[PDB]
Structure formats: structure tokens, C-alpha cells
Amino acid sequence: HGGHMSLLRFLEVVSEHIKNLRNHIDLETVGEMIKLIDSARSIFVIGAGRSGYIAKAFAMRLMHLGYTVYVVGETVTPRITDQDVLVGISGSGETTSVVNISKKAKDIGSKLVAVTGKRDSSLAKMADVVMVVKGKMKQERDEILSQLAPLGTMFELTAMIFLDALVAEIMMQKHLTEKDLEARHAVLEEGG
Amino acid sequence: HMSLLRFLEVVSEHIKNLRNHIDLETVGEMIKLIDSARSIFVIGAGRSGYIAKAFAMRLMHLGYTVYVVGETVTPRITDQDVLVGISGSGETTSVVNISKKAKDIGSKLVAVTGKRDSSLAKMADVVMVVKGKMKQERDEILSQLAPLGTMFELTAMIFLDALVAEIMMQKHLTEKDLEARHAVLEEG
Amino acid sequence: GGHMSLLRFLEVVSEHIKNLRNHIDLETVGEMIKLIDSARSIFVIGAGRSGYIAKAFAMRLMHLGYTVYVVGETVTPRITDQDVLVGISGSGETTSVVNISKKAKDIGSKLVAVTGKRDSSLAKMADVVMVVKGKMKQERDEILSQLAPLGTMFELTAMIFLDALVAEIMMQKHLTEKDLEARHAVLEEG
Amino acid sequence: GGHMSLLRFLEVVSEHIKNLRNHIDLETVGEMIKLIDSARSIFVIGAGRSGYIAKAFAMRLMHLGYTVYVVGETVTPRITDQDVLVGISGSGETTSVVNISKKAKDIGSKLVAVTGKRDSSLAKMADVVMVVKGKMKQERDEILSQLAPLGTMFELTAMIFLDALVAEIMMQKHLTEKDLEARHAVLEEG
Numbered sequence: 001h002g003g004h005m006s007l008l009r010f011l012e013v014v015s016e017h018i019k020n021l022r023n024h025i026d027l028e029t030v031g032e033m034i035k036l037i038d039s040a041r042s043i044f045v046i047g048a049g050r051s052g053y054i055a056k057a058f059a060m061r062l063m064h065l066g067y068t069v070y071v072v073g074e075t076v077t078p079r080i081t082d083q084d085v086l087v088g089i090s091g092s093g094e095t096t097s098v099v100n101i102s103k104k105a106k107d108i109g110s111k112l113v114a115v116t117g118k119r120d121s122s123l124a125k126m127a128d129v130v131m132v133v134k135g136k137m138k139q140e141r142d143e144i145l146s147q148l149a150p151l152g153t154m155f156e157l158t159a160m161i162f163l164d165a166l167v168a169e170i171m172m173q174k175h176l177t178e179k180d181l182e183a184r185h186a187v188l189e190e191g192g
Numbered sequence: 193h194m195s196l197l198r199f200l201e202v203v204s205e206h207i208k209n210l211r212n213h214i215d216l217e218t219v220g221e222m223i224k225l226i227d228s229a230r231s232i233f234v235i236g237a238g239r240s241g242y243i244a245k246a247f248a249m250r251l252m253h254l255g256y257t258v259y260v261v262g263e264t265v266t267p268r269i270t271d272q273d274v275l276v277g278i279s280g281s282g283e284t285t286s287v288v289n290i291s292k293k294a295k296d297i298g299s300k301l302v303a304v305t306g307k308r309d310s311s312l313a314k315m316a317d318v319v320m321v322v323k324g325k326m327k328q329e330r331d332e333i334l335s336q337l338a339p340l341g342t343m344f345e346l347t348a349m350i351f352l353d354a355l356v357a358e359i360m361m362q363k364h365l366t367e368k369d370l371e372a373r374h375a376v377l378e379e380g
Numbered sequence: 381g382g383h384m385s386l387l388r389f390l391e392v393v394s395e396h397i398k399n400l401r402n403h404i405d406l407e408t409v410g411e412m413i414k415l416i417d418s419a420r421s422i423f424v425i426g427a428g429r430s431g432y433i434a435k436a437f438a439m440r441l442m443h444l445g446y447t448v449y450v451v452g453e454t455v456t457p458r459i460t461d462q463d464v465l466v467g468i469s470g471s472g473e474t475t476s477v478v479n480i481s482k483k484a485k486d487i488g489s490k491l492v493a494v495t496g497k498r499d500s501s502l503a504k505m506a507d508v509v510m511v512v513k514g515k516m517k518q519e520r521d522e523i524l525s526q527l528a529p530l531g532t533m534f535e536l537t538a539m540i541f542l543d544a545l546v547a548e549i550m551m552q553k554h555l556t557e558k559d560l561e562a563r564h565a566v567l568e569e570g
Numbered sequence: 571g572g573h574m575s576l577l578r579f580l581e582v583v584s585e586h587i588k589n590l591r592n593h594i595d596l597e598t599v600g601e602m603i604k605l606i607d608s609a610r611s612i613f614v615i616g617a618g619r620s621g622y623i624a625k626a627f628a629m630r631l632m633h634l635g636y637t638v639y640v641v642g643e644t645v646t647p648r649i650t651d652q653d654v655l656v657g658i659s660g661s662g663e664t665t666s667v668v669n670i671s672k673k674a675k676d677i678g679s680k681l682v683a684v685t686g687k688r689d690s691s692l693a694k695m696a697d698v699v700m701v702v703k704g705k706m707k708q709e710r711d712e713i714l715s716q717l718a719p720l721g722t723m724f725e726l727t728a729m730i731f732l733d734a735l736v737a738e739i740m741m742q743k744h745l746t747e748k749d750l751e752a753r754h755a756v757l758e759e760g
Contacts, residue, residue, distance in 0.1 A: 004216050006361035010354040011211045018207060022200045027193050048378040048452075050249060053242040056644045057345075060239060063645045064340070073427075075625045075640050076632045077755050096380030100479060101757050108756075146367040148357045151253070151374060156246075157353060161346060165199040168337045172195035178339040184647045185340060187677075188613075188670045189237045191285030233567075237642075245454045252455045260454050262617070262666075264435045265442045266565050289669060290567050297566075375456050376487075377425075377480050381600040385741040389734040390591035394584045401580040406573050427758040429629060432622040436725075439619060443720070475760035527737045529747035530633070530754060535626075536730060543726060544579040547717045551575035557719040564720060568617040570665035 010148045017158050020137055025162075032129045033113050034170060037067065040085035040111065046072040047089035048097045050156050055089050058163040064181040065170055072101055082109030085128075090114070091135050091155035093121020102126055115163070117155045133159045199337045203346060209326060210347055221318045222302050223359060226256070229274035229300070235261040236278035237286050239345050244278050247352040253370035254359055261290060271298030279303070280324055280344035282310020291315055304352070306344050322348050389527050396537050399516050404541075411508045413549060415490050416446065420462035423489070425451040427476050429535050430468040437466070437542040443560040444549055451480055461488030469493070470514060470534035472500020481505060494541070496534045512538045579717045583726060589706055590727055601698045602682050603739060606636065609654035609680065615641040616658035617666045619725050624658050627732040633750035634739060641670055651678030654697075659683070660704055660724035662690020671695055684732070686724045702728045 037043055043062055047055035055071065062069040070077040072086070080086065086105045090098045093116040102112055106126050114127035117135045124130040135155030136142050145154060171177070226232060232251060236244035244260060251258040259266040261275070269275065275294040279287045282305040291301055295315050303316035306323045313319045324344025325334060334343065360366070416422055422441055426434035434450065441448040449456040451465070459465065465484040469477045472495035485491055485505055493506035496514045503509045514534035515524050524533060550556070606612055612631055616624035624640060631638040639646040641655070649655065655674045659667045662685040671681055675695055683696035686703045693699045704724030705714055714723060740746070 001362075002216065002220065004219050004358050007214070007216075007219060007354045007358040008211065010357035011207060011214075011350070014350055014354075015204065015207050015211065018200060018204050022197060022204070025196075025200075027196075030193055030196060049375065050246050053246050057239050057242050060644050063647060069645055071644050072757050073755075074643060074645075075629050076638055076643075076645070078632060078753050079756055094380060095378070096479075096483075097378040097476070100475075104475075104757055104760070143367075147360070149353070150356075150360070150367040150370050153353050153356075157350060160349060161200070161203055164338070164342055164346060165196045165203075167339075167342075168199040169193050169196040171336065171339070178335040181339045186238065186642075186646050187648055188615075188641050188673050189284075189286040191283070191673065235567075249454050252457060258455055262565075262568050263453060263455075264439050264450050265448050265453075265455070267442060267563050268566055285669070285673075286666070289665070293567055293570070293665075373457050375452075376458055377423075377451050377483055381596055383596050383599055383738050386594075386596075386599060386734045386738040387591055389737040390587055390594075390730065393730050393734075394587045394591070397580055397584040397587065401577055401584075404576075404580075406571065406576075409573050409576060410571065428755065429626050432626050436619050436622050473760065474758070476758040525747045526740065528733065529736075529740070529750050532733050532736075536733060539729065540580065540583055540726060543718070543722055544576045544583075546719075546722075547579040548573050548576040550716065550719070557715040560719045565618065568664070568666040570663065 006148065013145070013148055013154070014157060017137070017154055018161060021133065021158055021162065026132065029129060029131055030166065030169070033131050033166070034173070036085045036111055036113055036129055037062070041081065041083035042068040042070065044070050044072055044077070044080050044084055044086045046086065046098055046101055048095045051089040051091065051095070051159070054156060054160050054163065055087070057160065058087070061167045064184050065167065065174065065176060066184065080105055080108055080110050085111045085113060087113045087115065088123055089159060090123050091117045091152040093118040093123035099123055115159055133162050195337060202334065202337055206326065206343060206347060207350060210351065214351070215321065218318060218320055219355065219358070222320050222355070223362070225274050225300055225302055225318055230257070230270070230272035232256055232258040233261050233266070233269055233273060233275045233294070234258065235275065235287055235290055237284050239341060240278045240280065240284070240348070243345060243349050243352065244276070246349065247276070250356045253373045254356065254363070254365065255373070269294055269297055269299050274300045274302060276302045276304065277312055278348055279312050280306045280341045282307040282312035284312070288312050304348055322351050385527065392524070392527055393536060396516065396533060397540055400512065400537055400541060408508060408510055409545065409548070412492050412510055412545070413552070415464045415492060415508060416441070419464040419490070420460065421447040421449060423449050423451055423456070423459055423463055423465045425465065425477055425480055426468035427474045430470065430474070430538070433535060433539045433542065434466070434468050436539065440543070440546045443563050444546065444553065444555065445563065459484055459487055459489050464490040464492060466492045466494065467502055468538055469502050470496045470531040472497040472502035478502055494538050510541070512541050575717065582717060586706065586723055586727055587730055590702065590731065595701060598698060598700050599735065602700050602735070603742070605654045605680050605682060605698060606631070610650065610652040611637040611639060613639050613641055613646070613649055613653055613655045613679070615655065615667055615670055617664045620658040620660065620664070620728070623725060623729045623732065624656070626729065627656070630736045633753050634736065634743070634745060635753065649674055649677055649679050654680040654682060656682045656684065657692055658728055659692050660686045660721040662687040662692035664692070668692055684728055702731050
């Protein structure tokens with residue numbers, strides 16, 4: 001009750017996972033991901049469920065940075081082509097809709113970045129760049145972690161934080177500031 | 193990739209700060225309101241709308257009757273319900289307008305916001321303060337690493353998942369209980 | 381500005397609505413209603429513009445007092461063998477919709493297909509097939525495709541059919557507009 | 571077994587589309603087309619079912635080669651005074667749509683109102699008032715609302731009008747179905 005111990009324990013776990021990401025992120029792979037995003041004609045993003053919401057948050061920021069970007073399945077998304085890149089977000093790398101769409105994109109000839117916790121997954125095996133962002137750590141039991149962070153919550157939070165870190169890095173590389181992003185952000189529903 | 197790693201360091205500092213300062217009394221009031229509602233409605237604009245949807249989906253997994261404002265199957269809000277509005281500034285126009293209409297109907301309102309005396313907070317029954325930009329943080333370095341609402345958004349997402357962990361404990365739920373409810377058609 | 385193509389499109393739509401009314405299988409309509417009315421909940425799905433039609437229909441089913449969800453949306457729960465899935469696809473071959481519908485059938489849900497193609501993958505797996513055509517028998521394809529590209533005519537005809545179905549269910553349930561008003565969302569509309 | 575309300579609804583819809591074909595203001599249509607073509611980008615919005623219609627139309631404008639966005643969606647950028655907003659609202663009083671349109675007018679964007687009410691709040695703000703009515707002169711409200719509740723007839727008429735407008739723009743631009751096929755999304759359809 002009043003102490004809300006599970007709330008606090010969850011936050012401790014999040015702290016440990018962000019530290020883990022800091023200490024283990026593959027910087028070479030981050031560079032390869034940035035290179036594909038920069039070299040593509042346009043960027044398409046996809047995830048299912050909560051990973052879809054992360055994909056949308058990332059796509060919105062790429063738009064703020066000045067990229068030509070779309071979310072798969074959304075209204076104004078045009079035909080994907082062999083000059084584009086698809087970024088698929090799936091913790092397991094087995095998410096059926098994301099795997100099926102990514103296979104179709106690969107057959108068209110688009111490149112694929114997989115943001116996933118599983119380097120050996122169906123999605124990762126198809127990918128040009130496999131950006132590994134773990135949910136569960138080596139030393140953790142899944143059953144214990146899932147009591148605080150069910151259904152892949154930890155992967156989703158870590159992937160969100162990673163993608164916002166990637167935005168920070170791209171801003172630095174492109175000498176973009178907050179004011180640059182502000183010029184592109186939507187204002188009709190927020191009022192600035 | 194120094195800026196990437198510096199961003200992660202800032203997020204680390206911010207989560208430590210959240211851990212130290214979360215108002216546990218207000219958390220209890222928020223949970224009480226969620227539990228007492230007939231239906232729960234959630235709303236946010238832009239990236240905060242994605243946070244709102246992530247939280248609504250988890251509430252559904254936890255067994256609540258829950259909807260996202262503006263979405264297809266969302267029914268008429270009533271004075272038996274609770275609206276949860278997510279807005280970093282507490283001044284987001286669409287969220288303030290919708291929340292005022294909900295209050296006129298008689299719904300209860302939880303504001304998840306960084307500004308305790310914002311328009312949104314002033315209307316709310318429970319003001320759940322979650323801050324993005326911290327007290328005396330160098331606005332210049334933070335804005336460059338974490339532009340627009342980025343820090344508030346990550347902090348709110350982390351807080352709402354922490355709230356889910358708390359509710360699971362209070363209801364004695366395990367992952368399998370949530371797995372029974374989750375949608376499988378797209379995920380597999 | 382005579383806008384002759386705009387006016388011609390409207391004339392074509394009227395002919396298609398008359399064609400739908402003249403040829404509709406009223407028995408299949410009854411079977412669709414029976415599945416909707418006996419389901420624990422109704423799930424709907426379509427890709428692209430057919431998805432927008434599915435969402436319009438789902439919203440109206442909610443107004444009629446059904447428990448209803450859109451596949452892939454935020455609060456949609458696990459589908460079960462107590463439910464019915466309504467899939468909308470002009471060709472009946474839309475890959476995402478076929479794949480989702482087959483998964484639903486494997487779980488044991490019932491399936492209604494709203495499609496232009498009675499022998500398509502989606503139609504052949506369905507419990508009830510509502511055949512709503514795009515091109516008519518004596519209609520030149522090249523004309524229709526210029527005025528109504530990419531399945532526009534199937535989509536309009538399917539939307540009109542589904543609103544007609546709502547009118548029917550309202551009558552059967554003795555509902556008026558006021559009953560639906562009690563359930564419709566007001567926060568964005570006022 | 572006869573589904574009389576279903577069939578009557580279809581008869582009424584076809585009469586409404588004939589009514590549209592004979593009462594539509596072609597001058598206003600031409601003004602709408604001119605704004606769509608002169609705008610840097612087109613933004614569309616509607617609430618609820620009218621939002622689904624807005625998305626269907628935005629998708630088609632994308633197929634035609636326009637730069638187009640749906641208000642509130644992920645990749646939609648800041649609207650400017652060089653853009654046009656198309657707002658769809660049957661009553662013209664839809665609060666969310668009116669509020670968004672007011673902000674767009676403060677920025678200086680042009681506004682097209684697709685509405686049934688020429689003196690509504692939304693219409694009064696608009697550069698072009700594209701009147702598409704749901705109820706006909708001689709119709710009784712209580713009768714139409716039983717078959718077509720909550721603005722159903724406006725919504726169908728507006729959807730059909732916007733598809734007719736697309737047919738007209740294709741003709742004026744010498745576009746064919748194959749041109750639109752080049753641009754349409756394929757991942758979820760196959």
C-alpha cells in the first residue's frame with residue numbers, strides 16, 4: 001500500500017537497464033544504422049502494438065530532423081521502394097505482422113534495420129543492420145523480470161530511450177538544435 | 193557517439209531523481225480513482241498520445257474497462273468515469289479543451305503533467321506531477337540532447353509502467369493474467 | 381468549368397447503388413446479422429481505405445450497443461471462439477487481412493467477408509460471404525477504372541451496404557437515433 | 571427475411587446522390603480545386619466518421635501526387651500560411667474541427683469547409699464553403715434519422731463527393747489509374 005514498493009522496485013530495474021545499455025551498446029552498429037537512415041531515399045517505420053507507438057514516436061522525431069519518413073499502414077504513406085529503408089521494432093524479432101511486412105519490403109528490395117532484443121530472430125536474420133537492444137539481461141530470470149515488466153515492457157522502454165538517444169546523436173552530427181526541430185513540429189492540436 | 197551516451201547519462205540521472213521524489217500519496221489517490229471509475233478514458237496529444245495509448249493498452253491487460261479519447265469504439269464519457277490527461281506543460285490546447293468538457297460532464301480527471309498549477313492541473317482531481325526538465329537543469333544542454341518534450345515523455349512513460357507494476361502487485365496479478373487479455377492477431 | 385467527370389462519377393455511383401439493391405442476397409444479410417447478434421464481441425479489419433470503412437462500421441455497431449473492436453487498435457483484447465471477425469477486402473486477397481483472418485479462424489472465431497470476389501482466399505475461408513461488387517456486368521472496365529481507380533467503387537458500395545445493414549439492425553432492435561445518441565462519443569464533437 | 575429497412579435505405583441513398591448531382595455548386599467545386607492545386611501542402615481533418623472520410627480523401631490526394639497530411643497524425647509537420655486545410659463536418663459545429671480550423675486561420679492557412687450547413691461556425695471561417703447536404707428539402711428529420719442516424723447521410727454524401735472530386739482532378743491532370751497505382755502503398759495489400 002502506502003510505500004508502493006513494487007512501483008519503486010520497477011524504477012530501480014529501469015535504472016539498471018539504462019546503465020546496462022550505456023555500458024553495452026554496440027557503437028559500430030549505431031553508426032551503421034545512422035548511415036542507412038541518412039542514405040535512404042525515405043524511411044519507413046513499423047511496430048505492432050506498443051512497439052508501434054515507439055515506432056511512431058521515432059518517426060515523428062525523424063520528421064522533426066528533416067527526414068522524409070512514414071509509418072507503415074498510415075494514410076499518406078506511399079509505395080516503399082528499393083531505395084528506402086524500413087525500421088522494424090520488435091522485442092522478440094518474431095512479431096508476426098512485423099516479420100511479414102519486413103519480408104515483403106526485403107522482396108521489394110528495401111533495406112531493413114531491426115531494433116530487437118534477439119540477434120538470432122526471424123526479423124534480425126532478414127536485416128541489413130541488427131540493432132540489439134535487450135529487454136532481459138544475461139543475469140536476469142525472465143519470470144522475475146516479467147512480474148514488474150510484463151509482456152516485453154523492459155524492451156519497449158529501453159528501445160524508446162535508445163531511439164531518443166539516437167536522435168540526440170543525429171542532432172549533434174547534423175548541427176541541429178531544438179529550434180530547428182521546433183520549426184517542423186505540428187502545432188494544430190498542441191498550440192505550441 | 194558522445195551525445196548518444198551523454199543522453200543516456202542524463203536519462204539515468206532523471207530516473208534516479210524520479211525514484212527519489214515521486215509523491216507516493218498522489219500515486220495512491222490516482223490508483224483509487226482508476227479503481228473507482230466505471231470506465232477510464234485516456235488522452236494525450238502527439239508523442240504524449242502514444243504514451244496515453246501505451247498506458248491504456250496496459251490498463252486493458254490489467255482488466256480495466258478503458259478507452260482512448262477520439263478512437264473508433266470509444267463510447268460517451270459520463271459522470272461515472274475518469275479521464276487521464278497527459279501533458280508536459282499542462283497547457284496543451286486539445287487536452288485542456290477535452291478535459292474541461294469531461295469535467296463539465298462530471299467525469300473525474302487525473303492530470304499527468306510537469307506543471308502543478310497549469311491549466312490542466314487546476315481542473316484535476318488528482319495532479320500527478322512528473323517532471324521532464326528538472327529544477328535547475330541547464331536548459332541549453334538539456335534542450336540539445338532532449339528537445340521539445342523528450343524528457344517529460346520518457347519520464348511519464350517510465351512512471352506509468354511503474355504504476356502498472358504497482359497495480360499488478362496490489363491485484364496479485366502475474367504476467368500470465370495479462371497475457372490472457374492481450375491481442376494476438378498482429379503479434380502472434 | 382462543366383466538371384463533367386465529377387458529374388459522371390455521381391451518375392455511376394447511383395447506378396451501382398441501384399445494382400446493389402436489386403441483387404442483394406437477403407438470406408446472406410440475415411446470416412450476417414445472426415452472427416453479429418450472437419457474438420460475444422465483433423472485431424473488424426480492413427487495410428487502407430477498407431480499414432477506414434471497417435472503423436466506420438465498428439463505430440456504428442458500438443452505437444447499436446454491441447461490444448466491438450478494431451483489429452490492431454489500442455484497447456482491442458484477445459479474440460476468441462465466441463467472437464466474429466468482419467473482414468473487408470475488395471479483391472479478397474489483401475495479404476494482411478487474409479493472414480489475420482486465417483489466424484482468427486484457427487482460434488475458432490467466426491468470419492464474415494465483405495468482398496467483390498466470391499472465389500477469393502478471404503471468401504473461401506469465411507462463414508458468411510457478403511459479395512459487394514466493384515465493376516458491374518455490363519460496365520466497361522476502362523471507364524470504371526478511370527473514374528473510380530484502385531477499387532473506389534467497391535469501397536463506396538461496401539460502405540453504403542454496411543450503413544444499410546445498420547438501418548436494418550436498428551429496425552429489428554426497435555432503436556431510434558436517440559438510442560444511438562446515448563452511446564456516441566462527445567468529447568471531440570461537442 | 572425481406573429486410574425492408576435495408577432496401578429502403580439503399581433507395582434513399584441513391585436519391586440523395588441524384589440530388590447532389592443536380593444541386594452541387596460547380597463554381598465552388600472549381601474554387602476548391604484551385605486551392606488544392608495552389609497550396610504548398612494540403613492538410614485534412616474530421617472528427618470520428620468524418621475523420622475516416624478525411625483520411626480516405628488524403629490517401630487519394632497522395633496517389634494523385636499532392637503533398638498531403640492528416641491533422642494529428644505522426645509525420646504531419648507544422649502547418650503554414652501557404653497550405654490549405656480541408657475540414658469535414660456535417661453540422662459545421664464539430665468542436666475539435668472548429669478549434670483546429672481557428673488555429674489554422676490564425677496561422678494564415680486557407681480553409682475549405684465540407685459541410686451540410688452553409689452558415690455554421692466552420693463555414694463562416696472558410697475561404698471555400700463546399701456545401702454537401704445530408705437532408706433534402708422535403709424530407710422529414712424523424713424519418714431520415716431512423717434510416718440514417720447521426721449524420722450518416724451527410725457522411726456518405728461527402729465521401730461520394732470527394733471521390734467524384736478525385737475523378738475530376740484526374741481528368742484535369744491527365745492522370746490514369748496506372749499513375750495512382752505507381753504511388754499507392756503495397757506492404758499491407760500485396
